[PDB]
């Protein structure tokens, strides 16, 4: 039916607008502030009674304030008798678990499940997200989660922006990133190689373009060395492509000092501020991927809508 | 023999005071934030089978402290702690804002959300002090102890206000009526109430004590104190259990006519006392320590919290 | 086009008034007790796929009416109703009668229990009026509408108390301060409040209106009215949303000095108005009917309940 | 070593009887009603860390007693009781008069709702006797103990009816067949069954003592008509033995005008007042059976405490 | 206009018969087992926003079928179906193999477990036929329909047993009393009962056709011994009518050797294979009852619908 | 002093080995299937107030075993067991067969379903070994211990492969990269990776012993093609060490035909039968890891038991 409303957090508003543009809608009116004493203030500026509500709130920026803002907004819509509340969380907070593997066993994803449980008790009915650090986070909920992939937009950018892409190779910065890399190399019909930590390279990278692909970049320590090792192995030029560009701490300083031809991230986190101080950052717009998932969750057009059919 | 106390980053000083009163050292925990702002918690010691009490207040950067508390509770619960208790001296998000919607009331969304998050994190029990509304106790299905600072406030009044026997308990707004009427009856004294500004009750030529549950920006308590000065009150005091003091509060109090502003230690005050000569704190760590004692139930089924002399 | 209203045994006059305001007949239901005291409920019509509103107040034998309500809600939910809303004008069990225990405070056991039973029975939504404490709204996870009689009380004051422009709004105890301060601000009048008995404020030679959310045994409101007479108030009124009037209340009011005791229809008053002449009732069916109209959402997304008179 | 027993207003002679047998005095509780008929409960002593048993029957003013029970259970849980067990000798709402909408069956709601209330109040364990249908045990997620009166009835038969070795056991309706056949097999006697629709008897009753056995007697229309039919078939004398003696409405008048030698019930429901107006009612005491189930629930003496070994 | 019927692997003919009666084709679904015995289910079409009914019986390899049912129910729920109904003609685990115990009764552990798994998988509604005990309805919090085969059995008796007006409806054991008295009352005929303790008969069967009626037949030892006893007591011809024909173990061998004129079952479990080795089996098709219940649950036609009125 | 280890039918060798290591006999339990395929469970001794551990693996007919585990857990829970732990060496349904959609991922319905059933049956704690994905730990709210066979594998390598100091740890696919580099880092040896698309190997294994390491082997098609590829690359001898030996379908025929010097599995699944038809299977006993985890869960020894410190 005709009852969709999009709201934005303070997390990232440019994207919230881009999605609404792609769907032909204006953003719902909402007051999101902080009181003097640090308490999150939310005021929904319009009736959501009977509406299909989508709240866009990345999990970047001051993460706990943004998370609290998201939970209050979701819960407020649910008690104002909204028909459905979907959290559109492009970058899911707390996905990563640096450990100290209790070598006899493994640690559990406390914080990712906590975040999931809070979304559930707040009253979220459905989650739309992008490239969960681990896809199993999908099973931390009982509500449907759509874990969308940036690979098609990356794959695109690669063919259109790297000339010798036909002859290149994709490298993984770490051990765990193999699947992703192998997926992209298989889709492109190119070679793959992987780096592991002193740091070692497995695979042929000599005299061909190397593309480091990973899910996110926070501190950037790892991709930077990886770029050094790829240069030492005789790669012509090195690129870095990450879906989530967190870039905290010394990250910006590291990339400018590193040998990257370009660092490509999607728009799931705001980059406008970071591009001002870093020339090698380029962004892939993923507003259509998200807009298309909201359009399909809404189910207003055809039941047999297939997500996979819409062009990019 | 299985009691463990842990502190968050919110308020270490009380956490130490409580552990002292119980003859315990604080459990080892690394509580920080990563580069990307995510709260990091690591329990540095075993809690398997232990009765764990986490002390965290809701002052400071409240959302970082709250998230840290939830991760600690949950982490303790999946580490097979026998019981996890959240000790939250000042409960965050308890005060509803609203424009007093007419025709109907707003709901305590954020206060219920905090309760819901504490429950799913795995809190088995909450110990707190002077909830903004006592009904917040009923937002949980686990037991909540809503402790009162009143006995310590009562003792402080008798010990520090020479003329306390002939004074008058003033409420800063219409809402705090039951608290001030409660204290005046306990002291066998008069009460008055202020509402925006008008004063109801006689306060001229007697010591006036403003009582409220908490003071944030302090605009209401300072205008009320002004009205009490213009109405001929000898000296005006402000007694609040929770001293948040955000924004211009310190500047407003120093410019205002208070003889003293008394708060408890439920929120850290050392920093604010360096910038305010008139803040005094009532230590309430024993009340909290005695409630923790009582939840643990290590001595007898029949220990009564009220039998312990302050 | 799927609304249905049903009545409990508790108050059927209001249930009819509400149904009238919505152009509806009450749904067919048999509500009795068996020989052995067990509540019998039989939904006499189909509720499959419908937006069901059960109107039941908590008065009379609260426990029989409450159990009856819970069985009706659950039966409708298991009969595959689209939505079941409990319309509870006077919420049972809200007042706390804790002997105080100063160290700390007792918890709303019975009020939380009632909320939990309504939820587990299968209530999707609560409509109620002037909850003893508005925080009871948060004892649920489903939406609760806590409606106010204040607008109807304001209107009644302006139309029936000639001197309302001057006057003064008195609270019977410390707890009702915020409620009386609310009405006085809406009316641009003075307030005072009574405690223990002591009076704080200025009754003078002005009309004093005692305002509180409910009157049970009426010991407090009648002593407050006496104190208001000793302070020289021209005439004393009592205005309460919930007129329970149990025990000696009716007898106490007749002996008291009230010019009138005004209550709303959230609880049935016909029997008690026969034994008390001072009781007048404010009809609130339009507030409840408008919350039901708004819950159903048949008109539009933006129907604002505050725009209707 | 921490067991506390509280009685409700439901039945106190029984709760005292249980307490005598365990060696305990009943815990202090104020259990009354306010002027507005709201139920008032106050726990007169600490239950912190205690294993609490609340005895409340499903008789009397059922909704008052039920609400009272729920408030006490909830109150003990929020006072940090270790465990709260509801001892409900006669489970309210078990029987459901309906009229199976030919083609289907009605569902048990009031018995399931009653179970759900016990659960949401905070009950950890139920002890009950002779549930109208044993499946009510599955209406809970907490353990339910459905004790049987059969052993006390078998004793009573062997010690109070002389010709018991050649007596017939008769079901007053079709639904009670299993219960009566079980007693006939234990006694090594014959049974017969009555069905109304005008009454029909299958089975031989001529010149033998007939014992009508059912789980409950309410209005007693059915057992009285069965008594007439049994005399019509030549039975020497007729007894009726029910577990729950509710006896509402015209029950006492019906039994005083019927041809019963005796009506035997348990004290799951108080009988002193009804016995004053009906010389035929006799009660068999079931306190020990309940006391023994509470002892086992508590688990004081041993892990391998077998409820089936204790003498009666 | 959003209704899909899907079939399990358990009984497809009924799934087809039901889909036919509603004018529908079965939804596309791949239901297999992997090499390693894990149940594989993959939904071949969109169910987003659709009213889904999964028909799976509790016949066959009960645990494999139960897992298949649970995975497709859950799969539909995470694919954002509006509602998912489990149509379970023969409810698994509904019969308790108690030793009854003395003193107390065991609990319906397995039947409640099945109920809890159906609920947690995401079932919104259950349609079933002749639950072994009607109380299983209360093991759920979602609606459950227990539908009866009695009207179809009543039709079959009148249409196929000519001397039906002077027959006897016999229960093979205690407990099946209410079922046989219900049918005897509908036909205005006599009833009798069999009990094992040596088998005993109460009621008259001499010179009249005896119809043994029960809810289900597993190993068939009781019904066959009962058939001998009905013959030795001088019944003209003996029939057996059961709603659920499981016929496991020696059942077929017992029936072929027994004196039954016919054993009549419904189609809730597939019989074609068993009819190939047993000639006395006749089947009553009940697809119209289940389909009509699916129609009424869907609520396509009218709120005032009531399936008591549909012909059969 | 409350430990009871009970065994399922799925693998009792381990159940005995675990109980032996703890100085205990297995609890008495009857675990069978009825004629009609329904799972029968009867607890042969009291568990009231006891700490119960039920050992069942996801091997064999997985759905029958899972149903048996769930019924035992429930039976113990309704018998007022103090705590019930599921010890599930090989977690069923943990592997995803999605054939990933290109824009988003599939949810883990089955695994979570299994998790949800364990939870709703009443499991208080899960002990498992080398979960296919460690995130399954977060599918529960009860604690899950995901134990590693790595230390035991590390022992076996040093003890049985003499040139182990110069060997390579090879991953059969992209997913196991992180698993093999962890082992190579522990041994201070080289790693390599195999990938399909024709099969590629990145890294170097020539003239060195190659050890294929993976979490489980089902049908064994990948590890056997990988072993052939390792032979084409000049590996001295090829080993396979997987935690979980399912070996269904052609696995045994494939392994016997393959060039493996040895295929090493742990005892999480019974191997005696498969070893009779395959001479290259060797088993690592991991019974001490599970027993020590049960010891630590019981908490009978101290608060500091450190799983880390006990030697295997
Ligand atoms: O008065 P009637 O119901 O006809 O017969 C009385 C029965 O009603 C109740 O169900 C009890 O079982 C009584 O035996
Ligand atoms: O079944 P295939 O596709 O032939 O082989 C893939 C793998 O399936 C299991 O992990 C086996 O260990 C195999 O190596």
Numbering used by the authors:
A (entry chain E): 1 to 197, 207 to 321
B (entry chain D): 2 to 197, 208 to 321
C (entry chain C): 2 to 197, 208 to 320
D (entry chain B), E (entry chain A), F (entry chain F): 2 to 198, 207 to 321
Paper text:
It catalyzes the pyrophosphorylation of D-ribose-5-phosphate (R5P), obtained from the glucose pentose phosphate pathway (PPP), at the 1’ hydroxyl group position, yielding the catalytic product 5-phosphoribosyl-ɑ-1-pyrophosphate (PRPP). PRPP serves as an essential metabolic intermediate for purine biosynthesis via both de novo and salvage pathways, as well as for the synthesis of pyrimidines, amino acids (tryptophan and histidine), and co-factors (NAD+ and NADP+). Conversely, PRPS2 displays ~94% identity with PRPS1 and shares exactly the same biochemical reaction.
However, PRPS2 shares 94% amino acid identity with PRPS1, with three non-conserved residues (V103, G104, E105, referred to as 3AA hereinafter) located in the Loop2 region of PRPS2 as one of the major variations in their amino acid sequences, as they are absent in PRPS1. To elucidate the function of 3AA, we solved the crystal structure of a PRPS1 chimeric variant, PRPS1( + 3AA) in complex with R5P, ApCpp, and Cd2+ ion by co-crystallization, where 3AA was inserted into the corresponding position of the PRPS1 Loop2. The structure confirmed that the insertion of 3AA led to the flipping of Loop2 and the outward movement of the α12’ helix. Notably, a non-conserved PRPS1 residue, K153’ (Q156’ in PRPS2), stabilized the α12’ helix through a hydrogen bond with the C-terminal residue L321’, which was well-observed in the PRPS1( + 3AA) structure. Meanwhile, the deletion of the α12’ helix from PRPS1 or PRPS2 abolished their enzymatic activity. These results suggest that the four non-conserved residues of PRPS (3AA and Q156’/K153’) are essential for the conformational regulation of the C-terminal α12’ helix and the subsequent enzymatic catalysis. Further kinetic analysis of PRPS chimeric variants (PRPS1 with 3AA insertion and K153Q mutation, PRPS1( + 3AA/K153Q); PRPS2 with 3AA deletion and Q156K mutation, PRPS2(-3AA/Q156A), hereinafter) exhibited switched enzymatic activities, where PRPS1( + 3AA/K153Q) displayed ~2-fold or 16-fold lower kinetic efficiency in R5P or ATP, respectively, compared to PRPS2(-3AA/Q156A). In contrast, 3AA in PRPS2 sterically blocked GDP binding at the allosteric site, abolishing the feedback inhibition response of PRPS2. These findings were further confirmed by feedback inhibition assays on chimeric variants of PRPS1( + 3AA/K153Q) and PRPS2(-3AA/Q156K), which exhibited switched GDP feedback inhibition responses. Conversely, the ectopic expression of PRPS1( + 3AA/K153Q) mirrored PRPS2 phenotypes, displaying stronger growth and migratory abilities than PRPS1.
